[PDB]
Amino acid sequence: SWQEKINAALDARRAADALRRRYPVAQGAGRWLVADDRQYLNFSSNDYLGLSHHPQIIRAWQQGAEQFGIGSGGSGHVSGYSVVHQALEEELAEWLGYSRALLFISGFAANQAVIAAMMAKEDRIAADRLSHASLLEAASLSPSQLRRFAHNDVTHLARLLASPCPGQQMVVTEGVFSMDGDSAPLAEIQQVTQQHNGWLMVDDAHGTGVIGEQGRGSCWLQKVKPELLVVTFGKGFGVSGAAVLCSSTVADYLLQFARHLIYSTSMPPAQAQALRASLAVIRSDEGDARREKLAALITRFRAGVQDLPFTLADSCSAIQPLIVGDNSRALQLAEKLRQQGCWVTAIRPPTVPAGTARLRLTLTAAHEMQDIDRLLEVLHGNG
Numbered sequence: 001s002w003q004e005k006i007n008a009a010l011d012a013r014r015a016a017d018a019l020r021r022r023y024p025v026a027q028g029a030g031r032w033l034v035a036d037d038r039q040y041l042n043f044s045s046n047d048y049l050g051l052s053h054h055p056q057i058i059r060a061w062q063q064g065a066e067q068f069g070i071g072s073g074g075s076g077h078v079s080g081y082s083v084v085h086q087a088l089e090e091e092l093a094e095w096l097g098y099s100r101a102l103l104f105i106s107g108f109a110a111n112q113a114v115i116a117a118m119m120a121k122e123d124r125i126a127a128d129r130l131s132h133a134s135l136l137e138a139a140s141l142s143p144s145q146l147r148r149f150a151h152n153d154v155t156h157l158a159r160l161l162a163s164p165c166p167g168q169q170m171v172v173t174e175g176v177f178s179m180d181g182d183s184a185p186l187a188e189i190q191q192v193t194q195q196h197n198g199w200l201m202v203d204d205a206h207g208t209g210v211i212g213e214q215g216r217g218s219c220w221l222q223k224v225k226p227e228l229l230v231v232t233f234g235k236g237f238g239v240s241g242a243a244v245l246c247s248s249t250v251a252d253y254l255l256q257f258a259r260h261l262i263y264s265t266s267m268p269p270a271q272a273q274a275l276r277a278s279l280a281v282i283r284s285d286e287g288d289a290r291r292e293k294l295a296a297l298i299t300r301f302r303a304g305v306q307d308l309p310f311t312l313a314d315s316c317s318a319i320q321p322l323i324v325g326d327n328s329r330a331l332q333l334a335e336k337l338r339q340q341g342c343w344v345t346a347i348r349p350p351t352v353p354a355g356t357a358r359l360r361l362t363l364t365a366a367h368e369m370q371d372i373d374r375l376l377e378v379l380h381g382n383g
Contacts, residue, residue, distance in 0.1 A: 125147070214287065
């Protein structure tokens with residue numbers, strides 16, 4: 001029965017594979033986390049540039065409602081394409097170097113809509129094994145053939161692409177991995193997929209706004225222009241939503257065939273105005289300053305960890321895993337940091353490889369130097 005299927009799946013769960021209850025917060029974005037009525041330094045949010053609370057983006061969100069109401073009233077293919085959506089699309093395309101941008105309500109939605117429109121059962125997706133769920137789940141729920149390659153292993157990927165395919169091949173990877181905060185070798189990857197007549201799709205959720213000139217992506221940084229670029233706005237941009245960057249013909253294909261783009265409700269115009277304001281800050285001199293601040297904080301953290309009984313991952317991202325090793329030690333370490341006012345969360349097998357239990361830390365441009373020092377001190381006294 002259905003209820004037996006559900007009860008049986010919930011009952012079978014081992015203690016290490018069960019997800020904890022969601023914890024309600026009063027504030028979850030940026031420097032401070034507020035849970036109950038207690039203030040914690042927040043080392044768990046994705047607000048990498050501190051823009052969720054920026055006065056200019058708040059104003060834009062607010063005025064946009066005055067000007068346009070809230071809901072768009074519908075889909076882009078009827079009366080839900082606002083002049084504000086068109087201007088944001090144009091601005092993103094100009095910023096990143098693509099002929100076209102198409103807006104989506106989330107990264108999950110963008111990824112699924114591209115893959116649903118472009119891949120048939122005959123085709124193959126070659127996906128990095130550590131791709132985040134937004135991408136992988138999309139590639140899974142497709143009728144195409146999904147094949148994973150070892151993390152960032154371009155030799156493995158070439159092997160994959162060389163295998164006979166009855167259709168076309170799409171390579172998918174992230175610019176900065178949600179997991180370890182490490183970068184993909186995009187240029188090398190772009191080379192072997194061209195060599196096997198494939199197209200390349202990069203999701204740059206964790207790099208967009210945060211690295212490269214004017215905060216352009218992981219792709220800019222590495223001088224690579226994949227056929228498809230997906231950017232999402234729930235992290236560094238401090239808002240919500242996503243866009244697909246692409247060519248004139250690919251955008252025309254998606255606008256004719258991608259049902260997810262054609263029939264979904266477009267985002268509130270006021271949300272798009274907040275995103276245009278976020279983009280402006282990201283491109284501005286203040287954008288450079290926030291990125292430079294974030295990099296200084298990462299430097300301060302990594303330098304302090306040298307003198308600690310922990311290891312670091314290969315990351316220059318705001319994402320800075322602290323490898324602890326032992327599961328009990330890591331959980332007790334996170335609990336203790338929380339007790340001392342530092343909000344962190346621990347991750348253990350099997351989400352991570354054996355013996356690589358760790359803290360999931362993130363830093364943001366809203367943090368201050370003394371915050372990093374407070375983290376280091378608690379880590380020393382409990383490490």
